[PDB]
Design a protein around this ligand. Structure first.
Ligand SMILES: Cc1cc2nc3c(=O)[nH]c(=O)nc-3n(C[C@H](O)[C@H](O)[C@H](O)COP(=O)(O)O)c2cc1C
Ligand SMILES: Cc1cc2nc3c(=O)[nH]c(=O)nc-3n(C[C@H](O)[C@H](O)[C@H](O)COP(=O)(O)O)c2cc1C
Lengths: 104, 107
Protein backbone atom coordinates (compact mmCIF):
# COMPACT_ATOMS: atom_id res chain seq x y z
CA UNK A 1 0.00 0.00 0.00
CA UNK A 2 1.19 3.58 -0.86
CA UNK A 3 1.62 6.23 1.88
CA UNK A 4 -0.20 9.61 1.70
CA UNK A 5 0.61 12.93 3.50
CA UNK A 6 -1.57 16.08 3.38
CA UNK A 7 0.01 19.40 4.49
CA UNK A 8 -1.20 23.00 4.78
CA UNK A 9 -0.14 25.18 1.79
CA UNK A 10 1.60 27.97 3.81
CA UNK A 11 3.75 28.54 6.97
CA UNK A 12 6.27 25.72 6.19
CA UNK A 13 3.62 23.11 5.15
CA UNK A 14 2.84 21.35 8.47
CA UNK A 15 1.42 17.78 8.12
CA UNK A 16 -2.39 17.73 8.84
CA UNK A 17 -3.20 14.09 7.77
CA UNK A 18 -1.39 10.76 7.09
CA UNK A 19 -2.96 7.43 5.93
CA UNK A 20 -2.30 3.96 7.46
CA UNK A 21 0.40 3.05 4.88
CA UNK A 22 2.47 6.15 5.86
CA UNK A 23 2.88 4.66 9.39
CA UNK A 24 3.70 1.15 7.98
CA UNK A 25 6.39 2.59 5.60
CA UNK A 26 8.03 5.19 7.93
CA UNK A 27 7.34 3.56 11.36
CA UNK A 28 5.89 6.90 12.68
CA UNK A 29 2.48 7.14 14.42
CA UNK A 30 0.35 10.12 13.25
CA UNK A 31 0.71 11.91 16.67
CA UNK A 32 4.54 11.98 16.12
CA UNK A 33 4.36 13.82 12.73
CA UNK A 34 1.18 16.00 12.77
CA UNK A 35 2.07 19.75 12.79
CA UNK A 36 5.64 19.14 11.49
CA UNK A 37 7.26 19.70 8.07
CA UNK A 38 7.96 16.28 6.41
CA UNK A 39 11.72 17.11 6.05
CA UNK A 40 12.39 15.28 9.41
CA UNK A 41 12.34 12.10 7.19
CA UNK A 42 15.64 13.31 5.58
CA UNK A 43 19.06 12.41 7.02
CA UNK A 44 22.86 12.48 6.59
CA UNK A 45 23.00 10.68 3.15
CA UNK A 46 19.91 12.48 1.65
CA UNK A 47 20.89 14.10 -1.72
CA UNK A 48 20.89 17.95 -1.32
CA UNK A 49 20.27 18.41 -5.11
CA UNK A 50 17.01 16.36 -4.75
CA UNK A 51 15.94 18.44 -1.69
CA UNK A 52 16.59 21.65 -3.75
CA UNK A 53 14.13 20.49 -6.50
CA UNK A 54 11.43 19.75 -3.81
CA UNK A 55 12.11 23.19 -2.22
CA UNK A 56 11.66 25.08 -5.55
CA UNK A 57 8.56 23.01 -6.61
CA UNK A 58 6.81 23.73 -3.23
CA UNK A 59 7.72 27.48 -3.44
CA UNK A 60 6.17 27.61 -7.00
CA UNK A 61 3.24 25.29 -6.00
CA UNK A 62 3.99 22.94 -8.94
CA UNK A 63 3.83 19.12 -8.94
CA UNK A 64 7.14 17.22 -8.46
CA UNK A 65 8.26 13.56 -8.30
CA UNK A 66 11.64 12.54 -6.76
CA UNK A 67 13.38 9.38 -5.50
CA UNK A 68 14.80 10.58 -2.13
CA UNK A 69 16.66 8.75 0.66
CA UNK A 70 14.61 8.98 3.87
CA UNK A 71 14.94 7.38 7.35
CA UNK A 72 12.35 5.25 9.24
CA UNK A 73 11.62 6.12 12.91
CA UNK A 74 14.10 3.32 13.92
CA UNK A 75 16.80 5.13 11.82
CA UNK A 76 16.89 2.62 8.87
CA UNK A 77 17.43 4.38 5.49
CA UNK A 78 14.89 3.63 2.69
CA UNK A 79 14.34 4.94 -0.88
CA UNK A 80 11.14 7.05 -0.87
CA UNK A 81 9.41 7.36 -4.30
CA UNK A 82 7.71 10.70 -3.52
CA UNK A 83 5.10 12.56 -5.66
CA UNK A 84 3.73 15.93 -4.45
CA UNK A 85 0.81 17.87 -5.99
CA UNK A 86 -0.71 21.23 -5.00
CA UNK A 87 -4.50 21.26 -4.18
CA UNK A 88 -6.09 24.43 -5.69
CA UNK A 89 -9.54 26.11 -5.53
CA UNK A 90 -11.03 27.32 -8.86
CA UNK A 91 -9.63 30.89 -8.26
CA UNK A 92 -6.14 29.25 -8.28
CA UNK A 93 -5.44 29.61 -4.49
CA UNK A 94 -3.32 26.72 -3.06
CA UNK A 95 -5.38 25.08 -0.23
CA UNK A 96 -3.01 22.16 0.57
CA UNK A 97 -0.28 19.82 -0.74
CA UNK A 98 -0.80 16.05 -1.17
CA UNK A 99 2.24 13.70 -1.06
CA UNK A 100 2.14 10.03 -2.15
CA UNK A 101 4.90 7.51 -1.24
CA UNK A 102 4.90 4.61 -3.80
CA UNK A 103 7.10 2.32 -1.58
CA UNK A 104 6.96 -1.51 -1.04
CA UNK B 1 -11.63 30.24 2.55
CA UNK B 2 -11.99 27.01 0.45
CA UNK B 3 -12.91 23.65 2.01
CA UNK B 4 -11.03 20.40 1.35
CA UNK B 5 -12.46 16.86 1.69
CA UNK B 6 -10.24 13.75 1.45
CA UNK B 7 -11.94 10.35 0.92
CA UNK B 8 -10.76 6.76 0.48
CA UNK B 9 -10.73 5.63 -3.21
CA UNK B 10 -13.01 2.57 -2.72
CA UNK B 11 -15.97 1.39 -0.56
CA UNK B 12 -18.18 4.41 -1.54
CA UNK B 13 -15.50 7.04 -0.73
CA UNK B 14 -15.88 7.56 3.05
CA UNK B 15 -14.44 10.89 4.29
CA UNK B 16 -11.06 10.45 6.09
CA UNK B 17 -10.09 14.17 6.47
CA UNK B 18 -11.60 17.68 6.22
CA UNK B 19 -9.81 21.03 6.68
CA UNK B 20 -11.13 23.82 8.97
CA UNK B 21 -12.80 25.73 6.06
CA UNK B 22 -14.97 22.61 5.36
CA UNK B 23 -16.51 23.13 8.86
CA UNK B 24 -16.78 26.93 8.32
CA UNK B 25 -18.68 26.41 5.01
CA UNK B 26 -20.91 23.38 5.90
CA UNK B 27 -21.39 23.83 9.71
CA UNK B 28 -20.29 20.16 10.25
CA UNK B 29 -17.47 19.29 12.71
CA UNK B 30 -15.02 16.57 11.56
CA UNK B 31 -16.58 14.08 14.09
CA UNK B 32 -19.96 14.49 12.29
CA UNK B 33 -18.65 13.59 8.76
CA UNK B 34 -15.66 11.15 9.16
CA UNK B 35 -16.47 7.68 7.70
CA UNK B 36 -19.50 9.02 5.72
CA UNK B 37 -19.96 9.62 1.97
CA UNK B 38 -20.18 13.41 1.28
CA UNK B 39 -23.66 13.03 -0.40
CA UNK B 40 -25.31 13.94 2.99
CA UNK B 41 -24.58 17.58 1.84
CA UNK B 42 -27.26 17.11 -0.93
CA UNK B 43 -31.00 17.76 -0.52
CA UNK B 44 -34.32 18.06 -2.37
CA UNK B 45 -33.35 21.18 -4.46
CA UNK B 46 -30.03 19.55 -5.58
CA UNK B 47 -29.83 19.00 -9.41
CA UNK B 48 -30.04 15.19 -10.03
CA UNK B 49 -28.23 15.62 -13.42
CA UNK B 50 -25.24 17.25 -11.60
CA UNK B 51 -25.21 14.35 -9.06
CA UNK B 52 -25.17 11.83 -12.00
CA UNK B 53 -22.14 13.66 -13.56
CA UNK B 54 -20.27 13.40 -10.17
CA UNK B 55 -21.26 9.70 -9.82
CA UNK B 56 -19.97 8.79 -13.34
CA UNK B 57 -16.71 10.83 -12.94
CA UNK B 58 -15.84 9.20 -9.56
CA UNK B 59 -16.68 5.68 -10.91
CA UNK B 60 -14.14 6.29 -13.77
CA UNK B 61 -11.67 8.16 -11.46
CA UNK B 62 -11.79 11.23 -13.77
CA UNK B 63 -11.45 14.79 -12.40
CA UNK B 64 -14.70 16.86 -12.41
CA UNK B 65 -15.79 20.44 -11.52
CA UNK B 66 -19.49 21.30 -10.87
CA UNK B 67 -21.59 23.93 -9.10
CA UNK B 68 -24.04 21.98 -6.88
CA UNK B 69 -26.69 23.08 -4.33
CA UNK B 70 -25.72 21.71 -0.89
CA UNK B 71 -27.11 22.16 2.65
CA UNK B 72 -25.36 23.24 5.88
CA UNK B 73 -25.88 21.10 9.04
CA UNK B 74 -28.67 23.56 10.09
CA UNK B 75 -30.41 22.92 6.71
CA UNK B 76 -29.43 26.29 5.11
CA UNK B 77 -29.02 25.84 1.30
CA UNK B 78 -25.75 27.12 -0.30
CA UNK B 79 -24.09 26.92 -3.74
CA UNK B 80 -20.94 24.73 -3.61
CA UNK B 81 -18.27 25.24 -6.32
CA UNK B 82 -16.85 21.66 -6.20
CA UNK B 83 -13.67 20.21 -7.82
CA UNK B 84 -12.91 16.47 -7.29
CA UNK B 85 -9.70 14.71 -8.46
CA UNK B 86 -8.24 11.24 -7.91
CA UNK B 87 -4.88 10.96 -6.05
CA UNK B 88 -2.80 8.23 -7.80
CA UNK B 89 0.44 6.48 -6.76
CA UNK B 90 3.27 5.77 -9.25
CA UNK B 91 1.77 2.33 -10.18
CA UNK B 92 -1.41 4.13 -11.39
CA UNK B 93 -3.60 2.98 -8.43
CA UNK B 94 -6.10 5.52 -6.95
CA UNK B 95 -5.17 5.97 -3.21
CA UNK B 96 -7.72 8.76 -2.42
CA UNK B 97 -10.06 11.41 -3.84
CA UNK B 98 -9.57 15.10 -2.95
CA UNK B 99 -12.45 17.60 -3.18
CA UNK B 100 -12.00 21.39 -2.96
CA UNK B 101 -15.18 23.49 -2.52
CA UNK B 102 -16.01 27.21 -2.25
CA UNK B 103 -19.35 28.73 -1.11
CA UNK B 104 -20.36 30.76 -4.23
CA UNK B 105 -23.93 31.65 -3.05
CA UNK B 106 -23.18 35.43 -2.74
CA UNK B 107 -23.83 37.36 -6.04
C1 LIG C 1 2.76 17.03 1.10
C2 LIG C 1 4.25 16.96 1.24
C3 LIG C 1 4.83 15.73 1.49
C4 LIG C 1 6.20 15.60 1.61
N1 LIG C 1 6.73 14.37 1.86
C5 LIG C 1 8.07 14.25 1.98
C6 LIG C 1 8.72 12.97 2.25
O1 LIG C 1 8.00 11.94 2.34
N2 LIG C 1 10.06 12.93 2.35
C7 LIG C 1 10.83 14.03 2.23
O2 LIG C 1 12.09 13.92 2.32
N3 LIG C 1 10.30 15.25 2.00
C8 LIG C 1 8.97 15.41 1.86
N4 LIG C 1 8.44 16.68 1.63
C9 LIG C 1 9.37 17.80 1.42
C10 LIG C 1 9.79 18.59 2.62
O3 LIG C 1 8.63 18.76 3.43
C11 LIG C 1 10.34 19.96 2.19
O4 LIG C 1 9.33 20.61 1.39
C12 LIG C 1 11.66 19.93 1.39
O5 LIG C 1 12.60 19.08 2.08
C13 LIG C 1 12.24 21.36 1.14
O6 LIG C 1 12.70 22.02 2.33
P1 LIG C 1 14.15 22.70 2.54
O7 LIG C 1 13.83 24.18 2.61
O8 LIG C 1 14.64 22.14 3.85
O9 LIG C 1 14.99 22.31 1.36
C14 LIG C 1 7.04 16.80 1.49
C15 LIG C 1 6.47 18.05 1.26
C16 LIG C 1 5.09 18.17 1.11
C17 LIG C 1 4.47 19.51 0.84
C1 LIG D 1 -13.52 13.77 -2.31
C2 LIG D 1 -14.99 13.96 -2.56
C3 LIG D 1 -15.62 15.13 -2.18
C4 LIG D 1 -16.98 15.32 -2.43
N1 LIG D 1 -17.58 16.48 -2.03
C5 LIG D 1 -18.89 16.69 -2.27
C6 LIG D 1 -19.55 17.94 -1.87
O1 LIG D 1 -18.89 18.82 -1.26
N2 LIG D 1 -20.87 18.05 -2.14
C7 LIG D 1 -21.57 17.09 -2.78
O2 LIG D 1 -22.78 17.25 -3.04
N3 LIG D 1 -21.02 15.91 -3.19
C8 LIG D 1 -19.72 15.68 -2.97
N4 LIG D 1 -19.14 14.48 -3.37
C9 LIG D 1 -19.96 13.52 -4.13
C10 LIG D 1 -20.72 12.46 -3.39
O3 LIG D 1 -19.87 11.95 -2.34
C11 LIG D 1 -21.11 11.33 -4.36
O4 LIG D 1 -19.93 10.91 -5.07
C12 LIG D 1 -22.17 11.64 -5.44
O5 LIG D 1 -23.28 12.31 -4.82
C13 LIG D 1 -22.62 10.33 -6.18
O6 LIG D 1 -23.71 9.53 -5.62
P1 LIG D 1 -24.88 8.89 -6.58
O7 LIG D 1 -24.18 7.62 -7.01
O8 LIG D 1 -26.20 8.58 -5.88
O9 LIG D 1 -25.01 9.93 -7.65
C14 LIG D 1 -17.77 14.28 -3.12
C15 LIG D 1 -17.13 13.11 -3.51
C16 LIG D 1 -15.78 12.91 -3.26
C17 LIG D 1 -15.13 11.64 -3.72
Amino acid sequence: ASGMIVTDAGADQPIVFVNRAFSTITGYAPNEVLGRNARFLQGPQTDAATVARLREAIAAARPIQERILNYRKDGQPFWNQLSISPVRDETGNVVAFVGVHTDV
